[PDB]
With several copies, the nearest count.
Chain A
């Protein structure tokens, strides 16, 4: 219930080329996350990294190439850990691997906060259905298990019968899209989900974007806010160490602004930071700078500012 702050590592992925994403929490932990947050006068509670062990064959090969049942089922264990953390009065930060963890953290939140809304910052809409993308895409496919209007087009995969769609199409706003499949594009249109693509930001501005965003979410009533920030939303020059880097994305300035704005509502309840994959960096510098950016996002969302803060009454 966002009075203090919980840090939860959830190193989940499906393996294959994007398996260094499971190493993201350490990378961010190693960007000095907790210092910052501690030094932002936050009471912190570090809930550690979750067990991610494949079902039902934990032999080598499955670890390198994981099955969907294994993720869906690790999200169940996540929703539970998110749920209890909210229940004890904490704001959830979940350091991620692949954007699929959003399934467990939104499901967890919804549970003790059923009026919540979502800001999905991302180059992708991650809103494919199981029948619209490959076995591999579950990271780019998690929003069709949460939205409540898609269940007519969404089948029962084993590991996923616990998920109970906890969002209507009018509770999620997208910021930063530039890489959207036709299946996704039609869904956005057809079910009247509002979104601000890189085009709408060129036109409107990050200032007017956030203005329009809040009106559509918290405009006629206060709700708890769930920021699912995906790192590939930042232009790749800023965030190179990620699996699907798409060019033309947020500047550093745009991204902090978004965080700055979310904090300034003082309604933020849970935050997801995902797709940080150090195996994909050109150097240690590139891995480090990506995680440094990811520590800034969180810091901002939890009160960091570019112009000062805190307390002083200075001496002579």
Chain B
């Protein structure tokens, strides 16, 4: 199998270094490449190296910033990334390259994430989504948090049935927002307390928020 690693969040202008650990003893006899996938775009071949490291080939997209290397003694391929931009943000994949009538990549890895965002670490402003079908949906808006994730509970998981938390949007700025929502019966509003507890462990930021602005 092929297994890549040492992806992570790096700031523009930043450097980073991938490894790919191959299983085959025939790893040292075989060309390997690097292909990256920008988030939900297609595949772009980035670099390729020979069994011995006498020959390296680079894409115009990544040439002179990125440097492909291997250590056959350690059955590892490397990719050194310098001068990183937003547009390098992609899952990076090692692959074996072999020939027959033409060229095909027959062995691949799971991938590793490189995020290159300008945005610095922070916690979010939490705002209630008050309620105005017999049942009602109430919620909390978790606004401008960097980076992922946020971990959210209503009445510390005691409220479980009908809780709906969406996948966050990555804003143009690089800052995330997500929406949390629970469906309840309209009788229930006054007597019982509604709080979406929220956690941004990165920032060690915890916010408990009360949802009562129905005004009716």
Task: Let me know if chains A and B touch directly in the complex, using CB atoms closer than 8 Å.
Answer: yes
Residues of A within 8 A of B (CB): 15-17, 19-20, 23, 59-61, 63-65, 278-279, 281, 283-284, 287
Q: With A and B bound together, what is the CA distance between A283 and B26 in angstroms?
A: 8
Q: Write the nearest CB–CB distance from A290 to chain B, whole angstroms.
A: 13
**With contact pairs A60-B48, A63-B50, A63-B55 given, residues A19 and B26 touching in the complex (Cβ less than 8 Å):** no
Chain A residues within an 8 Å CB radius of B101 = 16
Task: State the Cβ distance, A17 to closest chain B Cβ, in Å.
Answer: 6
* Inter-subunit contact A60/B25 (CB<8 Å): no
Q: In the docked arrangement, what's the CA distance between A19 and B98, Å?
A: 9
The chain B residue sitting closest to A11, CB to CB, is: B52
Q: Besides the contacts A23-B28, A64-B99, what 18 more A-B pairs have beta carbons closer than 8 Å?
A: A17-B98, A17-B99, A20-B26, A20-B29, A20-B30, A20-B51, A23-B29, A23-B51, A60-B31, A60-B48, A63-B50, A64-B31, A278-B26, A278-B29, A279-B29, A279-B30, A281-B26, A283-B25
Shortest distance from the beta carbon of B180 to any chain A beta carbon, whole Å:
50
Question: Cβ of A284: which chain B residues have Cβ within 8 Å of it?
Answer: 25
Enumerate 25 A-B pairs (CB-CB under 8 Å) in ascending A order. A16-B99, A16-B100, A16-B101, A17-B99, A17-B100, A19-B98, A20-B26, A23-B28, A23-B29, A59-B57, A60-B48, A60-B57, A61-B103, A63-B50, A63-B55, A64-B31, A64-B98, A65-B99, A278-B26, A278-B29, A279-B29, A279-B30, A281-B26, A284-B25, A287-B25
4 tightest A-B contacts by CB? A64-B99, A279-B29, A20-B29, A284-B25
How far does the alpha carbon of A281 sit from the alpha carbon of B51 in the complex, in Å?
A: 16
CB-CB < 8 A to B130: which residues of A? Answer: none
Give the nearest-CB partner of A20 in chain B. Answer: B29
Residues of A within 8 A of B97 (CB): 64
Tell me which residues across on chain A come within 8 A of B99, comparing CB atoms.
Answer: 15-17, 19, 64-65
A139 to chain B, nearest CB (A): 15
On chain A, the residues within 8 Å of B100 by CB distance are 16-17
- Of the four ranges (under 10, 10 to 19, 20 to 34, 35 or more), the interface on chain B belongs to 10 to 19
- Bound CA–CA A281/B98 (angstroms): 16
Proximity string of chain B (88-120) to chain A, C-beta cutoff 8 Å, 1 when within and 0 when not: 000000000111111100000000000000000
Interface of B is mostly: mixed
- Which single residue of chain A is at the shortest CB-CB distance from B24? A279
- Whether B103 and A64, one on each chain, are in contact in the complex, defined by CB atoms closer than 8 angstroms, is yes
Determine the chain A residues whose CB is within 8 A of the CB of B102 once the complex forms. 65
Chain A residues lying within 8 Å of B25, measured Cβ to Cβ, are 281, 283-284, 287
Interface residues in B2-44 by Cβ distance below 8 A to A read 25-26, 28-31
A187 to B31, CA, bound (A): 39
| A118 nearest CB across to chain B (Å) | 30
Within 44-72 of B, Cβ neighbours of A (below 8 Å) are at 48, 50-51, 55, 57
A51 nearest in chain B by CB position:
B54
Q: Which partner residue on chain A sits nearest B28 by CB separation?
A: A23
Residue of B nearest to A279 (CB): B29
Expressed in whole angstroms, the minimum distance between the Cβ of A220 and any Cβ of chain B is: 47
Query: How far, in angstroms, from A61 to B97 measured CA to CA in the complex?
Result: 10
Expressed in whole angstroms, the minimum distance between the Cβ of A81 and any Cβ of chain B is 19
B55: A residues at CB distance < 8 A = 60, 63
Q: For A65, what are the chain B residues with a Cβ–Cβ distance below 8 Å?
A: 99, 102-103
A59, B58: Cα distance in complex, Å: 11
The chain B residue with its CB closest to the CB of A21 is B29
Q: How far is the CA of A287 from the CA of B25 in the complex (A)?
A: 10
CA distance A278 to B103 in the complex (A): 20
A222 to B57, CA, bound (A): 53
Q: Who on chain B is nearest to A14 by CB?
A: B99
Q: Which residue in chain B gives the minimum CB-CB distance to A18?
A: B99
Per the 8 Å Cβ criterion, residues 130-169 of B in contact with A are none
- Nearest CB of chain A from residue B61's CB, rounded to whole Å: 16
User: In the assembly, what is the distance between CA of A61 and CA of B33, in Å?
Assistant: 13
A161 CA to B6 CA in the complex, in Å?
Answer: 53
Residue of A nearest to B25 (CB): A284
A283 and B23 CA atoms in complex are apart in Å by: 12
Q: Which residue of B lies closest to A17 (CB)?
A: B100
C-alpha gap A281/B24 in the complex (Å): 11
Give the residue name and chain of the A residue nearest to B55 (CB).
A63
Distance in angstroms from B141 CB to nearest chain A CB is 51
List chain A residues, Cβ under 8 A from B98: 17, 19, 64
**Bound state CA distance, A64 and B100, in angstroms?**
9
- From residue A257, how far is it (CB to closest CB) to chain B in Å? 32
- CB B101 to nearest CB in A, in angstroms, measures 8
CA separation between A15 and B31, bound complex, in Å?
12
Give the distance in Å from the alpha carbon of A279 to the alpha carbon of B55 in the complex: 19
Q: For A20, what are the chain B residues with a Cβ–Cβ distance below 8 Å? A: 26, 29-30, 51
- B-chain residues with CB within 8 Å of residue A283 when the two chains form the complex: 25
Closest to A22 in B: B51
The docked-state distance in angstroms from the alpha carbon of A86 to that of B98 is 37
